[PDB]
Symmetry: D2
Subunit: 348 residues, 4 copies
Amino acid sequence: KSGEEVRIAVLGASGYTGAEIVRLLANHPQFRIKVMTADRKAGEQFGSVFPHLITQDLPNLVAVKDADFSNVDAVFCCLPHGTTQEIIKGLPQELKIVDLSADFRLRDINEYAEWYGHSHRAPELQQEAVYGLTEVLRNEIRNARLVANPGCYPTSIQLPLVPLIKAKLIKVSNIIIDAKSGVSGAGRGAKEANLYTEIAEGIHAYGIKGHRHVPEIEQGLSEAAESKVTISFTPNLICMKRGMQSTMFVEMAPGVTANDLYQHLKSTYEGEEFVKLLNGSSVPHTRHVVGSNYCFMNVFEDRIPGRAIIISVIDNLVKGASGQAVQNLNLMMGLPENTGLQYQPLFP
Amino acid sequence: EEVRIAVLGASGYTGAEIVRLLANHPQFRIKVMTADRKAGEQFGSVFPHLITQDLPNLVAVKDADFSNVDAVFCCLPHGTTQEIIKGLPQELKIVDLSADFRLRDINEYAEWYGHSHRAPELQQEAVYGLTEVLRNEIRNARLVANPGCYPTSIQLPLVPLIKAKLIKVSNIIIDAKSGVSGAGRGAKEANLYTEIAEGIHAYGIKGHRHVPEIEQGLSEAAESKVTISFTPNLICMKRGMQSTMFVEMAPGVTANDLYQHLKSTYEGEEFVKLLNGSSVPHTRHVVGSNYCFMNVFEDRIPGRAIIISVIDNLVKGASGQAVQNLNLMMGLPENTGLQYQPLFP
Amino acid sequence: KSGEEVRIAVLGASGYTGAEIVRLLANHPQFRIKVMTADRKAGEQFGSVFPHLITQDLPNLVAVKDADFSNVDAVFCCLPHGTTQEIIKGLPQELKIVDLSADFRLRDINEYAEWYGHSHRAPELQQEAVYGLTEVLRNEIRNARLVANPGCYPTSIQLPLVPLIKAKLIKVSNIIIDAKSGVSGAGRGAKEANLYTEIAEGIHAYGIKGHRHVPEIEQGLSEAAESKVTISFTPNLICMKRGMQSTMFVEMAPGVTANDLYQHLKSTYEGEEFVKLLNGSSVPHTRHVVGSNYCFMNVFEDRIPGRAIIISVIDNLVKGASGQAVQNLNLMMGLPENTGLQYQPLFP
Amino acid sequence: KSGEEVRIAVLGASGYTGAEIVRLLANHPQFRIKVMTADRKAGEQFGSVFPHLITQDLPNLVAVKDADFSNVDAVFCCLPHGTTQEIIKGLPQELKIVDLSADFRLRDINEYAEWYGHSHRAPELQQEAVYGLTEVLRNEIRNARLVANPGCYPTSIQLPLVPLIKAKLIKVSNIIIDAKSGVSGAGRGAKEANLYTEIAEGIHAYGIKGHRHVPEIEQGLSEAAESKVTISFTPNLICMKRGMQSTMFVEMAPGVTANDLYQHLKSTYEGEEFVKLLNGSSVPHTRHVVGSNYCFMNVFEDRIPGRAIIISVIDNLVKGASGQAVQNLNLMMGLPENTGLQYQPLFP
C-alpha cells in the first residue's frame, strides 16, 4: 500500500472473475476493495466462498441493492446480462466503471438484442462506453468514465489482427480462427458438462458457427478494415483450467510475407509491456502466461502460398478478463498501467 | 485356428497397445517380441499393467526366429525398418506401423527423412493401410504400410468428398490436436507431466512429416497436386486426437450435402461413424476404441464448411487399424478383437 | 454371443454405474441388456445420455414402473437409497438380483438408519441378501438370489485385510487407513465441488471420521476377527477420473513379519484371477488397473518395528463396482467368473 | 524496487527451484539476481531455458567454476548433492547463504554418512549451519551466515508436530504419516517415470521405508521430544504439478482431546502470517495454497479413541522450497519476513 488509496467496489464477486480481482488487488498498492456484492451469498465472508483467500481482510458480501457508492471511487462490475445495464445506469457520476460483462461491448444496440435475447437497457450510456482493449484504444480509455472490458477470445484475436488490418497487410476474406480455452472460462456454475469427469483427458469444439463473441470480434475487425468483416470462429474447450490460444489462419495482401506481418507487429508492440512478440520462430505456449497479464504471440508462414499463421495466447482469466480490467482502471486513474500486474507466470 | 504373431519393437506404447488388443483376440497370439535396449526383460516389467499376460521375454531383433511366425507387426526406427523388413521371410503377412513404406514417391521420402529409401522394390508392393478406403487392395497385400494417426483422422472424411468433387482442393486449412501419448515413451524434458499438464501448444509448423502422407492421399483423390495447411497441437491429455478441417465447398454444395455423402459412404462401416444432427465429436468419446466419430458443420463464411473427426491416436490412429488390417489380410472379420467400447469417463 | 442368452435388466442406468455396466456387457457373450430405466431421463436414447456408447444397439430408457420382468433373467440395480429397498422388495422371485447401492450391505438395521438418515424398508429381505465380495464369500454368493454388491473402498480394503485377520497375522488395534479415489466415484451429478476447475491439480480429504463405508468395512473385519473392530478411515479425493488406492497401516501379531503377511496373501489368492499380489517390492499403481476388473496389491515392512504397510488398488468403477457386480452375476448364473471381464488395463 | 539493492547469485538455477526463485524475486523490491549458474545449460539465456520468464532481465547462465561472487551479497544454492558441501565451503566468508539442498540439514554427521554412504565433506561448517524452518528457528536464522533450507515434506510435517510434541500433547509412538506431493517435486530431469503419460490420471506410493526426508523429520521431532523418535513415513506421487499434503495420524497424550491440539496450534501460530490454522472443521485443500508461501492446517479427532488426525498443506515449490528460502534470507538481511512473499494463491 502506497500513494493515495482508491476505494474499490466489486459487483458480483462470487465467480472466478471476482476471485481474480481480489487476488490481483491484493498486490495493488493503491486499489483497495471496500465493497463486494453477491446477491446469492449476501452476509457471507468471501473466505467462505473462496477458501484460498481466507487470509485476506475483506468486507462481508452485501446485496448489490444495498451497496453504497457515495464513498467509492471505482467499480469492477460482473453481473448478469441486462441487470448490468440497469445497475450501471443508476450508479453515481463521480465514478470510474469497468464492466467485465459484454453488456456495453457492442455499439450496435440492435446487434445486442439479437445475440443476447433482449433490448439494450442503456442505449444512451452505450454511446459513452469505451471498448477496453488497452493497447489499442489506450487514448480513448484514459479519459473514459465507463469502460466495457473485452471478452477473452476477442482480446487474444484483436491484438494481432487489428494492427495488421489497419496497415492492410492481410486480407479480410477467409479469416479462419480455431480458438482453444481452459474450462475456467465457463465459470463456477454447477453444470454436468463442466465436471472433472466430463472434461479431463479430452477436448471438443463448441459454439460452432455462432459464438456470442463473434459480433464483438467482427466489430473490432470491421472498424480496422472500414468494411464489414465476416470471420470463421470455432472455439474448443480444453482439459485445463487456465490458458487460451487463438490460431488465426489468414491470407496476406499482395506481395506481403509472413516476415512483413512479424515486423509490423514488432514495431507496433515494441514498447508494450503486456503484449510480447516472441523471438524468431518460438511457439507461444498457453502454459507460459498462466497467472500473468501477458499476451505472447508470433506469426508464421503457411504452407499454402500467400497465407500466414498467427498464434496468440493469454491467461483467459487475466489479460483475457480481470487483468485487463485492472490495467484499464490503472490507466483511467492515471497510474502506471502495470501497477499490481507484474506477477510473473506460474510455471510449472 | 491360432495365428502366431511377432512384434518387432514392442517396448513402446505402440507395442503395449498391440499386446492389449491381441489379449482379447481369439486367433492372434504373440509368440515373439523384440526390443534391443530392453532385450531379455519380461514385458510385464516394462509395462506393469500387463503383468497378468503370458508373453515371451523380449529378445534382440537379430535373434528373432520368424521361421515359425505367421504375421508380423513392425514398429522400428526411422530407417532400420526398410532394411529389416526387406530381409524377412516370404511367407508372412507384414503390417508396418512406421512411416517408412507410406510414401510411394521414393523421392518424397528422401526429402522428408534425409536419407534415400532403402527398399524401393518393396515400396512398390506395399499397400497403404487406410482400411475403409483401400480395403480391396489391403486384402490382397503381403506388406501393409499402416497409416499415421493425423492422416487417418483426415483422409477418412476428405478422400470421399474430394472424389465426389463436393469440396475444393484449395485452402484446405487443418488444425489438428493430439494427446501426448503420440510423442512416445522416450525420456524427454518436453514431455514431462510438469512441462505438459495444464497447457497446450502448436508444433511442427508448416513442416510436419505427416504432411506429404496426407497430401498423397488427397492428391490421388483429386487427380491433381493438393497443397494443404496442416498445424498440429500437443494437448495436455494422454489419448485422443481431433482434426478440424476448414474447407471450401464446390458451387451450389451445402454442408448437409457433404454430411449426406459421408453418411452414404460410411453407413455400412462399423469403425467410422457419422454422428447425428449437429452433435459434436469429443475425443473423450472414442478413447480406448477403434472408432472414428465425425460430423460436418456450416461455416459462418458463405461457401465454407467445418469438418471434425476424432479417433484414439493409439488405436484407430495406430495399433487398432494395424490389427483391423491384419484381420482383413488373414481373412477374419475386421472387428475381431476390436469391439471394446470407449472407456468413458 | 455364445449359447444361452441371459436377459438383463438395469434399473437406474443414467449414471456412470449404468454406463460401465453397458460397456462391460457389450463384452459379455451371454449377458444381453433388454431393459434399462432412468427416473428423470425416461424415454430418451441411451446414446444421447452417453455419446461414447452411440454405436450400441440398446433399448430406449423407460420408467422403472414400465419394467417388464416376465422375460428377464437377471437385474442390476442402482438407485437413490431407500427407493432401492422398495423396488427390490417388490420384484419377482425367479430373478437373480445384484444391487450396486448400499441398501443391502449392512446387516445391522439400526446401523443403516444411523448412517443413511432413514429406516430400513426391507428388514426381512436384508437377511436373505449376501455381501458381494466375490473372492471372500464365493460359496454364499453362488446360491444367493439377492446380492448386495460391495462399495469400492470396502472392496480394496477387505480383500487384503480379511484373510490376514482370520489368520491372526495382524492385530485389530490401530488399523490406520488412508484411501485415495478418483472423482468418478462422486457420480455425474452437477455439483460445484466436482467441477474440473475445483478438482484439477489439487487434492483434499473428505468424510473425515464419518464416511458411510466405515461400518461396511468394520462389519467385514469384525466378522473376520470375531470381535468388534474399530478402524481409522480417511478418504481423499484425487484429481483423476478413475482409480482407487487404499493404504493400510497395520500392526502385526507377535513374531510376524511383513513377508509372513505377504506369503499368506499369496497362498490365499494364488488361484484368483482378479486379485493379484505383485512380485517382490513392486508398488501397485492405480494407473495400472484402470479399465480392468483387477485388484493389485502388495505388503511392505513399516519403519516402525512390528508394523506393516499394505497397498491395494482397483478401478473404483470396475472391481470397485460394476465389474464385481458382473463377476457376481456370472457366478450366480453358473458362468465362468471372468466372462466379459478379461479387458486388460488401458494404459497409458 | 526500493531501499538498497541486494545482489543475488543463484547456484544451480536451471531447475524448477531456480525458476521459482526468479519468479519470487521478480516481486521482491530489494533482491536482484545478478549471477546464475548451471553446468549443462551454461551460456544460455534463462528465457530460453524457461520461456515463461522471457520478459525478465537476467544474466546468461554461467558454469559455477566461472562464477564471480565479488559483486554478490547473498547466495541461494540448489546444487546436485555431494557437490554442495564442497562448493559452499569455498564461498567468501562474508556472503549470506541459503542452501536449498539437504546437505546441511542433518546436524549429526554420522547420520549423514550412515544414510548417504559417503562422509559429510564440511562437518566444521555443519556445526555453523542453521535449520531454516522459519517459524520454528526464527531467532537462530536471523543470526546465521549459512542456512540449511528445509525439505518440502519435513516443512509441512514439523510445523504442526513440533509444537505439539514440545507441549507433550501427543505421544511420540505410532506417528503414522501418509504424504502426497505434486510431481514438480521430482524435478525437470528427463525421466521416463515422470512423463505426462506415466503420471497423469494415476498415483502411486514411492520411497517406501527409506525416503531421505525421514532422518530430517525425525531430527526435528526427536529434538522436540528430547528422545529418539521413530516415525512411519510414506510418500505418494500425485498426478498434479504443484501441491503437497501430509496427513499425520497420531496418538494423543492421556486426557488430551483433538480440540486441545487445535487450541495449542491456534495459540502457537496466531501471530504467524504464513502458517494458518483453518476454522472449525474446514479441510485444507492443496489447491488453495498453490503459488503462495502459505501452510494451511487443521486437526480432527480420529474414530479410534485417543487418536487425532492432522492435515497440513503447502505448495511444495514455495513454502516447501524457494518461498521459505526467500523468507529466511529476508530475516538474515534484516528485511520484513514477508517481503515479496505476499502473492495470493492462484485458484482456480
